Design a protein around this ligand. Structure first.
Ligand SMILES: Nc1nc2c(ncn2[C@@H]2O[C@H](COP(=O)(O)OP(=O)(O)OP(O)(O)=S)[C@@H](O)[C@H]2O)c(=O)[nH]1
Ligand SMILES: Nc1ncnc2c1ncn2[C@@H]1O[C@H](CO[P@@](=O)(S)OP(=O)(O)OP(=O)(O)O)[C@@H](O)[C@H]1O
Ligand SMILES: C=C[C@@]1(C)CC(=O)[C@]2(O)[C@@]3(C)[C@@H](O)CCC(C)(C)[C@@H]3[C@H](O)[C@H](OC(C)=O)[C@@]2(C)O1
Ligand SMILES: [Cl-]
Ligand SMILES: [Mg+2]
Ligand SMILES: [Mg+2]
Ligand SMILES: [Mn+2]
Lengths: 189, 330, 190
């Protein structure tokens, strides 16, 4: 074969959640590199624990950006609710850390649902990941999200069956990608 | 059993015409195409007329009366929604019969002109009628640009084929990669009669030289080391017309021709002129010389003399291609 | 597991801006899979570069999207490791050029190199993934996100080190970086 064997597979009907810290670059300028990592370890350890409970598969950490998905690797119709419940636990956990530590950690949460490709790339140092426009969007929902609140798209709301009460997110006016692609956002109560 | 076929080659080499031929032979929308045929007719006339003054030496009209029609044509050149009034067809037809305009057509290799020019200009009366119904040869001659990848499915004797058409122009080539994986065979199309012309993209690089470079770049590609290529030396009709005319000499573009003589294993069509045979085969050997140099045993090259706008020829040639795919268990 | 601190590590963020544009989702390219196949090739040729003896000290940390991130100095007068990170950048460009000649593309690399003290180790609870943290990494990334195509953007302090080793630099001017503020950056001369 002329093309390296590719280790990727497609999966429809899944949910993606993104979480990022506010002014992280700014925060790293104050406390020592040693101390900062502890606050991050304290935070991301709890995060990973809650993930397994809520049936969410953690992907990877891009510095201060944490992301996991629901509906993988085995399909599930409860997927949307899982990610919503995930953020519920996350947002609360962030408060505890900020309270028991003193550091000003605040995070935005973004969710969207659709299809994704997943697997690994390259030869050296494999790390399970996901790729698709639906993932790119989920990432943009985090950018256009609100501190200490759960920002979701209309596609995610359709898989919620009307359990959680929502409100207009106006995500279009906060992020250019959301606007330019005609997206309707919502916020959790 | 399904065969995934990919069509490659430079821009305007006749790839889309091949896929069209598959539709006619193996696989309503005509009214939607009439608008396109009329554009080609307009595009052809405004191009010839606009180049008359920019050549060296410039070409002069045979009738001063026509200078007014020339002005008309240029006046409506860059108009968006052109409704094609009945005057337009009259003016078009008048210029087309002017010797000055016609002599400029002879030197059309000096600028950029579409291939369906002479065909459409010769039947303006037919197209002007509002009850005009495009013949099949009209649909084949119609030129339109390709931007993206188009999939065409069909069957021949209960056998499946998936044809992929792509744009040949430089900027449209970056999309080819999305077909390289799991392809049964490649069909490289070349404009055999474009030895005296230059590519649209820069107005300098020789058309055939671009064909040779692109082919060499395809043959020695890293993701197609075991992919056989069926070579379509297309536009054989125009090649002969040029060779016999005797105005534009091949050895004036490719000096190596002066040393080339017809092989002993050559198969000339009945009645075919020695000069035509020699030229058509010269071009074949230029492409083989490249394919012969490497890839030994891994993949093969199969030359074919083609004329895309000829359903008769295509039926015959594609039947020769179905054979290659089966003999080699592709 | 266990974490560890360092003094002189050289981080590098080599991105390919034009890829996001090239990525499409259609019925022919199999929902964007074909595109991801080419990316796989690119990452592959970048990964097999780590075998070259001259790059014995290079440590690929991971790939973010289509951004290749790696570092030198983790295995430790002595500044040559910084210069090596630059040498690795030129090599990636040689590899990306080859991909262009075969895919009929025009992909270009944007680099961001910086150096300083960082932390190394694993975090969380799920998987044993080695990663590095620190301000040095944050700034290195900015040196890429605000860079220019075909250029290697480096911070001021790095610029001096590279100059002592025999390299030449050019001031890019003062740019206001997110969270950092006014930083004076430089470009490497080839
Ligand atoms: N006389 C003649 N004209 C031909 C022949 N093959 C193609 N043509 C004409 O050449 C023109 C260009 O063909 P076309 O199929 O559009 O090119 P293409 O290779 O698809 O072009 P592109 O989309 O890559 S830009 C058309 O007008 C077509 O009818 C041939 O054998 N003889
Ligand atoms: N090991 C690592 N791997 C990847 N990226 C890392 C990293 N360590 C740090 N980073 C980078 O650290 C940076 C943090 O992200 P923002 O730039 S999102 O910082 P902000 O101030 O919080 O902005 P806000 O989101 O608007 O509030 C990114 O460049 C990460 O790649
Ligand atoms: C490779 C293609 C494509 C489109 C696939 C994709 O969804 C991404 O990988 C995400 C969004 C996605 O994988 C989630 C992580 C991260 C890091 C946020 C990616 C980057 O933004 C990629 O782009 C960059 C800029 O590297 C992007 C957008 O690239
Ligand atoms: Cl051609
Ligand atoms: Mg971040
Ligand atoms: Mg075409
Ligand atoms: Mn952040």
């Amino acid at each position: 074969m002329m093309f390296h064997k590719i280790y990727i597979q497609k999966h429809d009907n899944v949910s993606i959640l993104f979480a990022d810290i506010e002014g992280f670059t700014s925060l790293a300028s104050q406390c020592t590199a040693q101390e900062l990592v502890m606050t991050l370890n304290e935070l991301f350890a709890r995060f990973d624990k809650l993930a397994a409970e809520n049936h969410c598969l953690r992907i990877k950490i891009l510095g201060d950006c944490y992301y996991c998905v629901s509906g993988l690797p085995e399909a599930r119709a409860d997927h949307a609710h899982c990610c919503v419940e995930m953020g519920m636990d996350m947002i609360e956990a962030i408060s505890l850390v900020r309270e028991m530590t003193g550091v000003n950690v605040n995070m935005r949460v973004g969710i969207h649902s659709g299809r994704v490709h997943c697997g690994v790339l390259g030869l050296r140092k494999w790390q399970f990941d996901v790729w698709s426009n639906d993932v790119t969007l989920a990432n943009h929902m985090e950018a256009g999200g609100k501190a200490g609140r759960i920002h979701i798209t209309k596609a995610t709301l359709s898989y919620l069956n009307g359990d959680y009460e929502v409100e207009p997110g106006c995500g279009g006016e906060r992020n250019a990608y959301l606007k330019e692609h005609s997206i309707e956002t919502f916020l959790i109560l | 059993a399904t065969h995934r076929l990919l069509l490659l080659g430079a821009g305007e080499s006749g790839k889309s015409t091949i896929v069209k031929q598959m539709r006619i032979l193996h696989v309503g929308e005509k009214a939607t195409k009439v608008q396109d045929i009329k554009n080609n007719l307009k595009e052809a006339i405004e191009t010839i007329v606009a180049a008359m003054s920019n050549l060296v030496p410039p070409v002069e009209l045979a009738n001063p009366e026509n200078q007014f029609r020339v002005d008309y044509i240029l006046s409506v050149m860059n108009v968006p929604d052109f409704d094609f009034p009945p005057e337009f067809y009259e003016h078009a037809k008048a210029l087309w019969e002017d010797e000055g305009v016609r002599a400029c057509y002879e030197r059309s290799n000096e600028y950029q002109l579409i291939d369906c020019a002479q065909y459409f200009l010769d039947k303006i009366d037919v197209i002007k009628q509002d009850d005009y119904v495009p013949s099949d040869q009209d649909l084949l001659r119609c030129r339109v640009l390709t931007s993206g990848i188009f999939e065409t499915k069909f069957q021949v004797d209960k056998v499946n084929f998936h044809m992929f058409d792509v744009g040949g122009q430089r900027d449209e080539r970056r999309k080819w990669i999305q077909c390289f994986n799991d392809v049964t065979a490649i069909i490289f199309v070349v404009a055999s009669s474009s030895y005296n012309m230059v590519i649209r993209e820069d107005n300098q690089t020789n058309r055939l030289q671009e064909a040779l470079n692109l082919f060499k770049s395809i043959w020695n590609n890293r993701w197609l080391r075991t992919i056989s290529v069926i070579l379509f030396l297309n536009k054989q009709d125009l090649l002969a017309e040029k060779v016999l005319a005797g105005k534009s000499k091949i050895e004036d573009y490719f000096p190596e021709f002066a040393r080339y003589t017809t092989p002993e294993d050559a198969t000339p069509e009945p009645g075919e002129d020695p000069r035509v045979t020699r030229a058509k085969y010269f071009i074949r050997d230029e492409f083989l010389r490249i394919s012969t140099a490497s890839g030994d045993g891994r993949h093969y090259c199969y030359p074919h003399f083609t004329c895309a706008v000829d359903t008769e020829n295509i039926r015959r040639v594609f039947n020769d291609c179905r054979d290659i795919i089966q003999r080699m268990h592709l | 597991l266990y974490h560890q601190s360092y003094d002189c590590v050289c981080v590098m963020f080599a991105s390919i801006p034009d890829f996001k544009e090239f990525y499409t989702e259609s019925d022919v390219n199999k929902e964007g899979l074909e595109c991801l196949r080419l990316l796989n090739e690119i990452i592959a040729d970048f990964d097999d570069l780590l075998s070259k003896p001259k790059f014995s000290g290079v440590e690929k940390i991971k790939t973010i999207g289509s951004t290749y991130m790696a570092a030198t100095g983790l295995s430790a007068r002595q500044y040559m490791h910084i210069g090596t990170m630059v040498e690795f950048a030129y090599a990636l460009v040689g590899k990306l050029d080859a991909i262009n000649k075969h895919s009929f593309n025009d992909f270009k690399l944007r680099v961001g190199i910086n150096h300083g003290p960082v932390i190394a180790g694993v975090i969380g609870a799920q998987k044993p993934q080695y990663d590095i943290w620190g301000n040095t990494v944050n700034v290195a990334s900015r040196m890429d996100s605000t860079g220019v195509l075909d250029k290697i953007q480096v911070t001021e302090e790095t610029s001096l080190i590279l100059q002592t080793l025999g390299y030449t630099c050019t001031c890019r001017g003062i740019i206001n970086v997110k969270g950092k503020g006014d930083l004076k950056t430089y470009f490497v001369n080839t």
